[PDB]
Design a protein around this ligand. Structure first.
Ligand code: HEM
Ligand code: HEM
Ligand code: HEM
Ligand code: HEM
Lengths: 146, 141, 141, 146
């Protein structure tokens, strides 16, 4: 993934301020609320009946934390996303059957969450750098589909 | 969005499909699975090999639904209501995939209707399949 | 597609935007041009530098139209009729770009409405912008 | 751009039968008919008011021929489409202001036209190989956008 030094620094500096578990829970919860077809994978998580029940579901939060923790560690390998996420790509295709469009929807929701969380600090150029990153991750996770 | 000329074009082309509608549905699916492999994620319970009877059976159901849409072209939201419910609340197929199957249906019709697939009829069929896709995803959210 | 509760959510959120609508429209365009550079192909006649008067003026026109849509949410096709024509017949912007502006407008509201941008309001605003986009592209074909 | 031996053979064998002129004129004309907003780039071409006017318009046929001729030259360099189309990519961005989504629409229509022309010979696996190639060419043409 190619980012300028300036873009890379902007990504890392904001990420240093993120509570990965909180943001993970929030982004996965909003994904399931805003694009509810994504709930199809999570019927074992229990009550997803209302926005409040989703956001408060302990299983949703726990998965949010797992997903964003992997995202977070990926931010340390921005020059090698494809090889960093290769095994997870294979897992999501062959065993979990997750349409890669879902990675793109999560990317949109995460950007919205960071804007909500950081307000004016989430400037247009900082957003632009994060748009590259979430596209890059979604592409890296889709790479081994077949 | 479907003008009287569009409706006329769709009925003429689909009428020519006739008793092959099932066979063309199956071929469209096979084109879709090979050209857009991410769509296979919705069918892990199927044998997707060429000639599979699961794929042929599903292609007949898709085609039959389209025949019903053509016959009710002025009342499609009602005629497809139960199918809209099923896709929105149970199958939960991402709306992007409907464009991919629509394209593969168009390619299938082009390959089998040399005389009928004129530019005007192509435009009307594309509009028709976009309307059907819109109806099928209308209750998702 | 917009339920009564969605309409209620949009009106409260947009009411909160209030007099800042034009400024937020300008910010959403700048976010779009920076994040999705292909959208700049529609504005080669503009100075797209930050804070340019053309961009601020266009932001205000976009915001005004959304205010009109919020005020007539139960009759949006009628309300945005002239704008539907203009995009279909003259500007002819590819429909995919409306999704990109919609996303940047949502990001702009998130960044400015911390108290109001709850999960449910987020969902309603996304739906609302998709309906606006649908109306503006409805006469393309 | 990587194609399997089977995919490359399918592409090359079919293309040997294509009359670039005839197919190019058909594919551009159908683009203008089926997605008529694309006509915004061709105001100086004359009468585009009806499908019959579009398809028989000589400036459409001539431009169609130029476009598929350059596409054709790219099939001879499938291992490096980005380097092959770099100059045309800059042209389409900086001088013509063409939204790269148009390259994808042309890709879709071209596949329909090959199906229409060749019928049963355009099998599902041959289509699949062509879908990879039209996606690769569109991505190569959008690469120098900024
Ligand atoms: C940035 C995107 C994503 C990343 C980095 C990611 C990462 C992960 C990780 C680390 C696992 C655990 C695998 C293991 O246990 O070895 C996982 C599992 C899973 N993910 Fe993804 N994921 C992402 C997006 C998604 C999305 C958008 C969905 C679906 C809406 C999804 C659905 C699942 C499912 C169903 C599981 C299995 C959970 C379980 O078995 O408990 N993932 N993911
Ligand atoms: C023109 C669009 C479509 C039509 C007319 C259509 C129609 C249908 C019909 C008639 C059924 C069977 C319902 C029954 O048993 O009564 C079905 C099932 C199904 N559809 Fe759709 N469909 C369309 C597009 C799609 C797309 C784009 C996908 C996914 C790529 C999809 C995925 C499925 C799945 C997974 C099933 C269930 C198969 C099974 O387990 O038997 N559909 N569809
Ligand atoms: C929510 C979506 C949108 C709304 C409500 C909207 C509304 C408007 C309005 C109100 C005008 C000015 C009409 C006038 O006063 O004459 C306009 C012009 C224009 N729009 Fe749209 N627009 C939207 C999305 C887009 C998109 C996605 C693009 C392109 C990326 C676009 C490109 C243009 C252009 C190029 C102009 C003309 C600018 C000028 O030369 O002054 N619009 N739009
Ligand atoms: C496979 C995709 C394409 C290829 C290989 C291609 C190639 C070319 C070439 C070789 C030229 C000639 C430039 C010159 O005269 O120096 C050109 C010009 C042009 N192309 Fe593209 N093109 C493609 C797709 C498109 C599409 C889809 C559109 C717009 C819908 C488009 C719009 C134009 C325009 C407006 C011109 C200029 C015509 C004039 O001089 O009046 N192109 N293209």
């Amino acid at each position: 993934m190619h980012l300028t030094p300036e873009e890379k620094s902007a990504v890392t500096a904001l990420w240093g301020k993120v509570n990965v578990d909180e943001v993970g829970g929030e982004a996965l919860g909003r994904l399931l609320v805003v694009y509810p077809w994504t709930q199809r994978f999570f019927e074992s998580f229990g009550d997803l009946s209302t926005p409040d029940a989703v956001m408060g579901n302990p299983k949703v939060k726990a998965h949010g934390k797992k997903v964003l923790g992997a995202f977070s560690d990926g931010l340390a390998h921005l020059d090698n996303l494809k090889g960093t996420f290769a095994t997870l790509s294979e897992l999501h295709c062959d065993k979990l059957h997750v349409d890669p469009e879902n990675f793109r929807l999560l990317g949109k929701v995460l950007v919205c969450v960071l804007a909500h969380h950081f307000g004016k600090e989430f400037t247009p150029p900082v957003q632009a750098a994060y748009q590259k990153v979430v596209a890059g991750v979604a592409n890296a996770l889709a790479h081994k589909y077949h | 969005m479907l003008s009287p000329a569009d409706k006329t074009n769709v009925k003429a082309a689909w009428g020519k499909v006739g008793a092959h509608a099932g066979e063309y549905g199956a071929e469209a699916l096979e084109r879709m699975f090979l050209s857009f492999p991410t769509t296979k994620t919705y069918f892990p319970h199927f044998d997707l090999s060429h000639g599979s009877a699961q794929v042929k059976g599903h292609g007949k159901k898709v085609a039959d639904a389209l025949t019903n849409a053509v016959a009710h072209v002025d009342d499609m939201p009602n005629a497809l209501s139960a199918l809209s419910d099923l896709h929105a609340h149970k199958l939960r197929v991402d709306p992007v995939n409907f464009k991919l199957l629509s394209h593969c249906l168009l390619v299938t019709l082009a390959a089998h209707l040399p005389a009928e697939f004129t530019p005007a009829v192509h435009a009307s069929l594309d509009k028709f399949l976009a309307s059907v896709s819109t109806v099928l995803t209308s209750k998702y959210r």
